[PDB]
């Protein structure tokens, strides 16, 4: 058991070792070194600014979490914030360092294998830092606050000095989750505004009197964009997956903890717990062990792929990493489930239909759902398949036709993945109730380290190819690096789709956790069916649902406008710099403006439940959560798939798959308009929604202990 | 005595419509060129109507046969009756509009004044308004008398079990059948006719830009006449049928809730079933919505009469707003007395949710009314260039085309919050006053004066056709100025009316969701506490799954419609090229586009009608309740977004055309960007949004009906 608790440190040390191993490889030409120095300075500047703002917000949140609820809650909040920030910083430094070494491998060896290995060892640092830091924080919470302080021992509803009631350990893990959520909100909202403002400004300066090339170091927005790629597909997506991972695990824990007070019967004058402390604690700890086994299998798959004999098929290598981790987790967790829950009593009252093996059936379902959902994102965004081919071909009909067909593509694309989620939820429940729904969220993210490593591979290869083309490298070297960039292009779409699906699953598990956390000491005798209830006929619930949907749409629109404003401001600063390059100057101007913009979306996401709950109650807030989730899922999938389809249709034409037309032609102009429209949608709105749907649920789960009984109307 | 006096009101409205029809027909058509252009337009309209009506009849017969085999035969009879009422209103309104398009221009030319032309156009639109009101309430009065009182379905009010074992309260199921009847007409009009309209508009612009280069606004271009036909197909038949469906849906929901409260609030005192809400109150609440709607129609006729007889003026918007406010205020006042005197001596209103006694539902109704107008205003705030958002979009036109698209999407997304919040507060307060019954009464009050709303909505396209005929006939510049002023006023009223229709659709869809939940009552829940029966638990994984599925289906529905418009447009372009290769063929291309649009609507219509049957026989009534919530939420948001975005794009293009952007005018690059934005937005505002308005209601109606079957007959 202690070995499992050690696995997180193994992953952190693995990250350190891969960091050193890639750092040992050669940087090469001095031109490459200068470009990468620009990139690293921009990245570190952005990181410092955002971490300053993060610390400012986190101290206030921890003080409020200690004043209300308990002090362990605020401590766990800060712990989780630190773990996620650490994973992000480590991954970003590693990526900004490895972007050149990948190109040097490709050039020196004139081969694809060594460059791919360098890039994947680079991304595995972010993957392993995510996994290790997250599960390390969780093990620390489970040991220090969990067993040492006996919060897993009492498992009864505690009433704090203010009168707020809650199960202690549940509230503690909730605080930890909220910490991760703050880190992720900062990363996604802010960094996304920044990244897409930089990309839009890069496109813009090309058309001003400056006549600055897009792929030229003379253009400051080029370096800002190369920094933003890392800010996005390494820090942002990694933090998003980390939040979903921890959310699934915390939801399992909260449901388990609150089942203990739920299933008590007043047989005489005594309250008899129909689910005893043994089973409850076993179910509190089973998710942590499942996730630790997942991290172990992830490290094994990464090891196999980094030591594997070098090959010339990158896509195959990354997919091998994924499938190895998946199957290993499946088998090992099979034995874990069967042996860890075998001798427990009362599992039938918990929803386990086939006994101790029920949740494993749930977990694996998640896994498969995930991969399948991934596939759908690729089907509707790759020009290898029919939809993007049709979109690209329709370019000849005009620009309005490109826009309409892209919107149509996204809207229709939301259905296959939603149906995958629907069947996954139905079957997971069939096996093990809402607990099994949470275990499905976990299984889907059981190998988060490998998923995040493949996600971070993309931007590293993108920067490698960009450095190669900015340094005017040999055409064969450019071919190698561009092939790596295309593989990363496909993996990016798959990873974004997987992240959206994971966010939806974790948000639904958090909704269940919210309902369970509504338990008051006065409902102890009441039948369980009466307490765990959100009635949709209650007009406050319908009203709250409409409100949540509207707030989600408004959130998205505000982010679009913020991106455009920040881009125009960066263009103004670049003009000022030309009249009077400024790399960190423009990077920091845009970073500060994006951080200023983040105030209102963050306040929306965090304060909507507080305001509405203290105003109208916990049924209204349940409605708001359902509306937010239902609209966020759809809008996320839509924006992601539409932007991906537009981008890859432009590529389809640029690759000459549409005879007669190439760069500069009118169809290419139309597709470029479509791609500029979609960039903010896929890289800012979708991920921001992935976060919204979860963080609003977390804030709700926590504050419902207060406003459940403290509401104005 | 007085009851029959009110029951006569529908015939008064139908006769008022006939009289206005005749009065405008007496007006002069004028020049032979105007007569020829209008002959083209009217022939196209009649052709479209006939083609769509054939398919409507086929589907309606299949549905009515199924409604007789299952449930009861009165259900199928009421279904066919409602289909006929709505189809009649649509045909009448469209024929009248195609007739009045010339007489408005003749008023503008002969008299060189705005007042007389406005009067001609408003007398034209009041035909559709009054036909909607009269036909709808006539069908409902007939149902309440024949099946209701004569056959004693308002007398038994107990759960009846049909030969198959399907259980339901008879009158509730009957009114549900009638609602489904109206819904079929509305679905046909909206989905099909909307695909047709936007395919026609897209083909007109394309052929204007194709190798043929046939000028826009030219009789030589057949798609120009097809588009002038589509304006009426959309904002007269489509929008009128939509408002009619929302109206009838609110009323039917009130009735179903009332009917099912009788079995719900029973107490099993030993061996006796004691109805805590007695038959007297149940029947009073079944009939109160009908009388409220009749009073509303009377006030609407009065406002319309005042505005058509009022001293002519030079301010048209003021005249239409006067009609609206008069109808609203009169309905408010009279319905106050109606409520207090009709529900005073009842018993059990407390157990029902009436917080302030017999006057509670009136408080709900008026709220609806205000909600409506406020929602209307919001649609105007986010689409008119008199206000900041559309101004900013137009100004941003200078900064590229991608910026136009991004800012339009942003505008639309943000625009859902003010109107959605209006709906939120309306629901909260309406419920506060009189429970879910009061939510239904709020929907009704919001639509209490539907005749005037539909008349103002149908005014728009008639004036649009008048201005188009004026520009195609090369009329005098002053007459053209008058017609262009009328067209802009019609544009604003169109935006406001579309927004009001969306808000009404959301309110009616929520009332129908409540009706679904009430209709789930089984004979085995007689003793169960009401809290146990009226329950849709959101933790049940089935319900969450169904909600996700419904949202996803709504998005897919929208995307399919977008693609269908382009397919029909491309085919119409091919037909125009063939016509050039071989006075052009007007009805030919109109009928080709109509048949293609009707063939395409088959699949969205099948989605909307069968999704609840498939998913319900598969997984049950909790899953379908989830589906309904997802559909309602996603449809509300997408409807508001698409409508407001299309309106903002169009009115920003107009903002520039008037030179409100110093330095840029027709032909400049910002104008090209705004033209792209408008071509993108046309299908969204005129096809997707309304189709969703329909989806969110018709799926609920089908669910309310079939839940009697699949509630207990489901596979998993």
Numbering used by the authors:
A (entry chain B): 4 to 583, 594 to 726
B (entry chain A): 2 to 583, 593 to 726
Sentences copied from the publication:
Membrane-bound pyrophosphatases (M-PPases) are homodimeric primary ion pumps that couple the transport of Na+- and/or H+ across membranes to the hydrolysis of pyrophosphate. M-PPases are large (66–89 kDa), single-domain integral membrane proteins comprised of two identical monomers, each with 15–17 transmembrane helices. The helices of each subunit arrange into an inner ring (helices 5, 6, 11, 12, 15, 16) containing the functional core (active site, coupling funnel, ion gate, exit channel) and an outer ring (helices 1–4, 7–10, 13, 14) of largely unknown function. To date, H+-pumping (H+-PPase), Na+-pumping (Na+-PPase) and dual-pumping (Na+,H+-PPase) M-PPases have been found, most of which require potassium (K+) for maximal catalytic activity.
Following the inspection of enzyme key regions and structural alignments, it became clear that all of the data from 0 to 60 s could be combined into one, yielding a grouped structure of TmPPase in the resting state that is essentially identical to the individual 0-s (r.m.s.d./Cα: 0.33 Å) and TmPPase:CaMg (r.m.s.d./Cα: 0.29 Å) structure. The structure was solved at 2.54 Å along h, 2.95 Å along k and 3.38 Å along l with improved B-factors (108.65–70.28 Å2) and Rwork/Rfree values (21.95/23.61%) as compared to the 0-s structure (23.81/27.40%). The improvement in data quality parameters also translated into better electron density maps, so we could model most side chains and build additional key loop regions, for example, loop. Despite the presence of PPi in the crystallisation condition, it was not located at the active site, nor did it bind anywhere else. There were no observable significant changes in other regions of the protein, but the semi-conserved glutamate E6.53 appears to be flexible in all the structures as indicated by the absence of 2mFo-dFc density, even in the high-resolution 0–60 s structure, or negative density when modelled as seen in TmPPase:CaMg. Ion binding is the first event, as there is no evidence of PPi in any of the structures before 60 s post Na+-addition, nor in the grouped 0–60-s structure, and the ion gate E6.53 appears disordered: Na+ binding precedes substrate binding. Our TmPPase structure obtained in the absence of Na+ (0–60-s structure) suggests that in low Na+ conditions, E6.53 is not tightly coordinated at the ion gate, allowing it to loosely interact with S5.43. This could thus explain why K+-dependent Na+-PPases can pump protons at Na+ concentrations <5 mM.
